[PDB]
């Protein structure tokens, strides 16, 4: 029910090894405009 001992800095930081986010798909809109998300459509700010 309750923690018996406090958690140290090193154990807390080991537990957060996998707690991250990843970079998205990001294909480039060739005809006009900047990057867009892949398999998506950007009617404005992109020709694709």
């Amino acid at each position: 029910a309750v923690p018996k001992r406090r958690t140290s800095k090193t154990r807390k930081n080991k537990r957060r090894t996998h707690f991250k986010i990843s970079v998205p798909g990001m294909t480039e809109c060739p005809n006009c405009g900047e990057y867009k998300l892949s398999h998506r459509v950007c009617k404005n700010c992109g020709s694709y």
Binding site: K20, I21, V23, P24, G25, M26, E34, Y35
Partner: protein, 112 residues
């Protein structure tokens, strides 16, 4: 040279800002702008405004060419906390911390 910009007392918690900020550290500016437009966290637009501000400082004050610039440093420090309460059952209150952040971006061209 180097140009920097700071955003002080942003009202998002630092643990949440650092998570997006670990995506752009050490990348060239155009790619970092692309990444920040397609990530859907709450702190993406705020970080993007800080990065834009640094890029504009790099060009108006130091006459640097923005075509070849990299994000040299990106980090978030803690600001002062707002302390609040929430009423719980049986007449008790519990604390709530509304945390804030200082956000710093510095860009460089890699020369001297």
């Amino acid at each position: 040279m180097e140009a920097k910009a700071v955003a002080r007392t942003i009202r998002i918690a630092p643990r949440k800002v650092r998570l997006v900020l670990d995506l752009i550290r050490g990348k060239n500016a155009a790619e970092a702008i692309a990444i920040l437009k397609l990530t859907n966290k709450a702190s993406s637009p705020v970080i993007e405004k800080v990065l834009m501000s640094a890029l504009a400082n790099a060009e108006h004050n130091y006459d640097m060419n923005t075509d070849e610039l990299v994000v040299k440093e990106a980090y978030a420090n803690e600001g002062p906390t707002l302390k609040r309460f929430r009423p719980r059952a049986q007449g008790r209150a519990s604390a709530i911390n509304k945390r804030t952040s200082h956000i710093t971006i510095v860009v460089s061209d890699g020369k001297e």
